[PDB]
């Protein structure tokens, strides 16, 4: 009897949202539907373009029901407030959306409440101004959740999906696979934070005050994550955005997506995560996440930069290019904070910088560098990461690099942190080595036959080449 | 130093309406004066304009209904960071 | 999929 999607987000051990308010920006809604009656406040904010009734409020009503619906909702308690920015054809404007977001911020300033979650179940093309408004609203301390988009395309080409600091959600089906419908389907790529159920999702139907309908889309997926976030923020109201994102990643089902569904180049970039509620089992734990930069592009001196959130520490830095035409990476300070920078090679199509960003309070972390010597440097403190860059066209708390490369060790004073190094090598397109259960991968690199790059996938270090050895640095409390 | 942007997805563009985004620290009073200034300068050139909204609280700036002909002029106004042509968003 | 969901 439990809808498949609500079972899917139920953790393997289990036992809301009322302190939290969820704002919805959408079509008009049927606020008297019995799923949501008394739970949604209609603001009567409206900013919509001219067209060009059951249908007028179908989309919004269903999503309000996914978030908070008494029978089929994720966060059955939760209070919602709705703004109308989509017309009867489901069409809105970037300007109308901006005015809506501004309205939410003004409401908050005038009558402050607790944590706010804003669900943006909509998409247009990449918009500088829409992304900036989302970022500013996120920085003001509001949580934003958006749909990845339904075009079976790179979510970085769409807004608010592409917007920095917003939680962007793709859709998976009952078989935990990315939704595809012909040439259409869930968007993907490095701007997607995670996936959630978004096919055949039962919820309130505005056809009649007690009716239900199954709908599909990345908004339905985004609505699951908005609900999960509302519950998480009710339990732990002081979470920063970075703490909330790390929990969402951490409590997700991992490696359940067949990445064959995605276009080849997007496989490495797309997180293999399906959202789930936190378990009843939960003491401090080390949370880390992998942050891919935008591609540097092909300029000879191009650099890609991957950054962590202000309250996170960069524990390691790796890089990847598909050609293997690469000058590696280094950790450099910037506004008094370490970032991961990767360098393109001459004639390279470009590279990605890949940060490992972790929640480590009381950490004092530094970088120890040695210029080309093979070349070696150690934390003379625990080693959490090795990086190496070179300026040439081609070739024990210790990092070792190529004799012609500079080598960089990330060293942290973090008492109460235990770390170990696990190695694995083989004859090979890809070699792989995973940390043990209960340990957190902090760093991933290849021993110095021609490697494309290295990157952490959850707690597994992956090395890609054209006698390769993957090296994982793993830590725990 | 002010730049112009419009939607790469051509069918989703909505020409004739522009979001004028001012520099981060711009004050509401400055946004209002800048909007009035655009309208006056436009009017001297024979153009009708309409200020649909003045933004403050997240981004400073304004929404203006005008011909794109005026964009070179608008990009030279004080406080302008960039201008974006309005475009469509859709239920997902 | 319903057509209220663009562009399904």
- Domains defined for chain B, CATH in brackets: 1-88 (3.30.70.80)
Resolution (A): 2.0
Which residues of chain C does B87 touch, with a Cβ-Cβ cutoff of 8 Å?
A: none
Instruction: Determine contact, residues A161/A221, Cβ cutoff 8 Å.
Output: no
Decide which of A223, A253, A282 is a domain's last residue. Answer: A282
Which of A327, A396, A340 lies closest to A367 in space, CA to CA?
A340
Residues A304 and A226 in one domain: no
Question: CB contacts < 8 Å between A and B, how many?
Answer: 112
Task: Let me know whether A107 and A190 are in one domain.
Answer: yes
What CATH number is associated with residue A336? 2.60.120.690
Nearest to C4 among A59, A150, A184 (CB): A59
Do A177 and A78 share a structural domain? Answer: yes
- Angle in degrees, 0-180, between the axes of helices A128-139 and A94-110, rounded to the nearest 10: 20
User: Token pair 């959740």 is at which residue?
Assistant: A145
Whether A368 and A293 share a structural domain: yes
Give me the catalytic one of A68, A127, A162, A219: A219
A26 is catalytic: yes
**Same domain? A193 vs A291:** no
Residue B91, chain C, CB below 8 Å: the answer is yes
Chains within contact range of chain B (3+ C-beta pairs < 8 Å): A, C
Kindly state whether residues A370 and A447 are assigned to the same domain: yes
Active site residue A33: no
Which residue matches tokens 């496989």? A267
Last residue of a domain, one of A282, A314, A341: A282
Which residues form the domain of A249?
Answer: 1-282
Same domain (yes/no): A328, A262? no
Tell me, yes or no, whether A203 and A306 share the same domain. Answer: no
To the nearest 5 percent, what fractions of chain A are helix, strand and coil?
15, 40, 45
- Residue among A33, A57, A59, A193 flagged as catalytic: A59
CATH number of residue A265's parent domain = 3.40.50.200
Experimental technique, in short, is: X-ray
* Beta strand pairing call for A326-334 and A253-254: unpaired
The question of whether A282 is a catalytic residue gets the answer: no
Three-state DSSP at A154 gives: strand
Taking contacts as CB-CB distances below 8 angstroms, the residues of chain B near A150 are: 92
Task: Output the CA torsion sign for A381, A366, A375, A351.
Answer: positive
Structure tokens at B43: 């009017």
A17: helix, strand or coil:
coil
Whether residue A20 is found in the same domain as residue A163: yes
Indicate yes or no: CB of B92 within 8 angstroms of CB of C7: no
Classify strands A21-26 and A116-120 as parallel, antiparallel or unpaired: parallel
Domain check: are A243 and A157 in the same one?
A: yes
**Which residues, 6+ apart, have CB-to-CB distance to B64 below 8 Å?**
B17, B18, B20, B35, B38, B49, B50, B51, B52, B74
- Residue C8 to residue B82: CA distance in whole angstroms: 34
Please give the tally of structural domains in chain A: 2
A281-286 long-range contacts (CB < 8 A, ≥24 apart) are A281/A13, A283/A477, A284/A477, A285/A440, A285/A476, A285/A477, A286/A358, A286/A359, A286/A360, A286/A417, A286/A440, A286/A442, A286/A475, A286/A476, A286/A477
Let me know whether A303 and A436 are in one domain. Answer: yes
Contact A150 C4 (CB under 8 A): no
Give the length of chain B: 92
* Beta-carbon count within 10 A of A338 CB: 20
The residue out of A254, A282, A310 marking a domain boundary is A282
A457 and A362 co-located in one domain:
yes
Q: Among residues A222, A172, A227, A167, which one has the least CA distance to residue A197?
A: A172
């Amino acid at each position: 009897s439990i809808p498949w999607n609500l079972e899917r987000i139920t953790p393997p051990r289990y036992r809301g949202g009322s302190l939290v308010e969820v704002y919805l920006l959408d079509t008009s809604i049927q606020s008297d539907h019995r799923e949501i009656e008394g739970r949604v406040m209609v603001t009567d904010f409206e900013n919509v373009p001219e067209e060009d009734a059951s249908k007028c409020d179908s989309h919004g009503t269903h999503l309000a029901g996914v978030v908070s619906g008494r029978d089929a909702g994720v966060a059955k308690g939760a209070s919602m407030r709705s703004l109308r920015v989509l017309n009867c054809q489901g069409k809105g404007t970037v300007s109308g959306t901006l005015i809506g977001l501004e309205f939410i911020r003004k409401s908050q300033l005038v009558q402050p409440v607790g944590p706010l979650v804003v669900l943006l179940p909509l998409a247009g093309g990449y918009s500088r101004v829409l992304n900036a408004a989302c970022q500013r609203l996120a920085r003001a301390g509001v949580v934003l959740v958006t749909a990845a988009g339904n075009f079976r395309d790179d979510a970085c080409l769409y807004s608010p999906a592409s917007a920095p600091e917003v939680i962007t959600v793709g859709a998976t089906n009952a078989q935990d696979q990315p939704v595809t419908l012909g040439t259409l389907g869930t968007n993907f790529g490095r701007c997607v934070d995670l996936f959630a159920p978004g096919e055949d999702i039962i919820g309130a139907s505005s056809d009649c005050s007690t009716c239900f309908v199954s709908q599909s889309g990345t908004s339905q997926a985004a609505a699951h994550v908005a609900g999960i976030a509302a519950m998480m923020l009710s339990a732990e109201p002081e979470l920063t955005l970075a703490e909330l994102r790390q929990r969402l990643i951490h409590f997700s089902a991992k490696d359940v997506i067949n990445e064959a569904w995605f276009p080849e180049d997007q496989r490495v970039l797309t997180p293999n995560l399906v959202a789930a509620l936190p378990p009843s089992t939960h003491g401090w734990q080390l949370f880390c996440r992998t942050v891919w930069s935008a591609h540097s592009g092909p300029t000879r001196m191009a650099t890609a930069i991957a950054r962590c959130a202000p309250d996170e520490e960069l524990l390691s830095c790796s890089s990847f290019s598909r050609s293997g035409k690469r000058r590696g990476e280094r950790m450099e300070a910037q506004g008094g904070k370490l970032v991961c920078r990767a360098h393109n090679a001459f004639g390279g199509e470009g590279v990605y910088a890949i940060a490992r960003c972790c929640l480590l309070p009381q950490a004092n972390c530094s970088v120890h560098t040695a210029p080309p010597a093979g070349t070696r440097v150690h934390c003379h403190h625990v080693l959490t990461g090795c990086s190496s860059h070179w300026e040439v066209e081609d070739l024990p708390n210790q990092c070792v690099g190529h004799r012609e490369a500079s080598i960089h060790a990330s060293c942290c004073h973090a008492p109460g942190l235990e770390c170990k190094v696990k190695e694995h090598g083989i004859p090979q397109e890809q070699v792989t080595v995973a940390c043990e259960e209960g340990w957190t991968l902090t760093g991933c690199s290849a021993l110095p036959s021609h490697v494309l790059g290295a990157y952490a996938v959850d707690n597994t270090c992956v090395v890609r080449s054209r006698a390769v050895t993957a090296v994982a640095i793993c830590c725990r409390s | 130093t002010a730049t112009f942007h419009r939607c790469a997805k051509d069918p989703w563009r909505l020409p004739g309406t522009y979001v004028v985004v001012l520099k981060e620290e711009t004050h509401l009073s400055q946004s209002e004066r800048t909007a009035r200034r655009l309208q006056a300068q436009a009017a001297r050139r024979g153009y009708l304009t309409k200020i649909l909204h003045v933004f403050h609280g997240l981004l400073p700036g304004f929404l203006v209904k005008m011909s794109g002909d005026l964009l070179e002029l608008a990009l030279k106004l004080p406080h302008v960071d960039y201008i974006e042509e309005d475009s469509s968003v859709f239920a997902q | 999929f319903v057509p209220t969901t663009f562009a399904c």
